[PDB]
Amino acid sequence: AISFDNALGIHQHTVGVRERNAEVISTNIAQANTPGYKARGLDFAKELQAATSGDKLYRLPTQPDTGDGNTVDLDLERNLFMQNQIRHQASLDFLGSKFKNLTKAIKGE
Amino acid sequence: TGAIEGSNVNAVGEMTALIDLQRQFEMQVKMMSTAEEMDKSSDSLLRM
Numbered sequence: 001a002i003s004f005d006n007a008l009g010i011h012q013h014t015v016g017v018r019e020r021n022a023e024v025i026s027t028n029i030a031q032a033n034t035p036g037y038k039a040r041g042l043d044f045a046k047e048l049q050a051a052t053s054g055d056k057l058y059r060l061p062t063q064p065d066t067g068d069g070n071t072v073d074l075d076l077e078r079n080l081f082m083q084n085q086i087r088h089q090a091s092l093d094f095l096g097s098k099f100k101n102l103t104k105a106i107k108g109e
Numbered sequence: 110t111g112a113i114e115g116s117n118v119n120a121v122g123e124m125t126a127l128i129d130l131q132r133q134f135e136m137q138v139k140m141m142s143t144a145e146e147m148d149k150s151s152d153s154l155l156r157m
Contacts, residue, residue, distance in 0.1 A: 078154045085157065 007102055011095035013051035018088035025081045028072050035068030039077075042089060 024042045039059040040065045061071040103109075 075149075075151060078151065082154045082157075 014091045017047045032072040039072045
């Protein structure tokens with residue numbers, strides 16, 4: 001034992017995935033008005049598995065498009081972006097406390 | 110022969126169509142206004 005992997009856990013890979021998800025969600029919000037653009041989804045479980053050791057998912061629209069072809073539901077995108085930011089803040093707190101505890105033990109302070 | 114045929118426009122029929130087109134037009138305009146009103150409200154979600 002006594003290794004950074006065994007000490008940090010999955011809180012280092014989770015942060016990267018949460019930032020990846022925010023990039024995907026922000027892309028859907030920006031491309032909301034572009035006709036023909038299809039909303040992009042991200043699988044957290046698969047992304048976390050790939051990050052730990054190392055495809056395109058589309059979001060099914062709740063209602064038909066008005067003709068443009070864009071399936072971005074901006075009501076859902078804001079809700080997911082808000083959730084992603086909260087869980088990302090927790091992951092930083094979880095990962096940040098891993099380093100603080102490691103520093104505390106190696107210095108006894 | 111000796112006569113000219115006029116138009117068959119029913120003036121009342123057009124006028125009653127006009128007043129119904131106005132009201133239906135105005136009701137949909139209110140739908141546009143309440144659509145952006147909902148959109149403005151659902152913007153504090155990302156306002157941390």
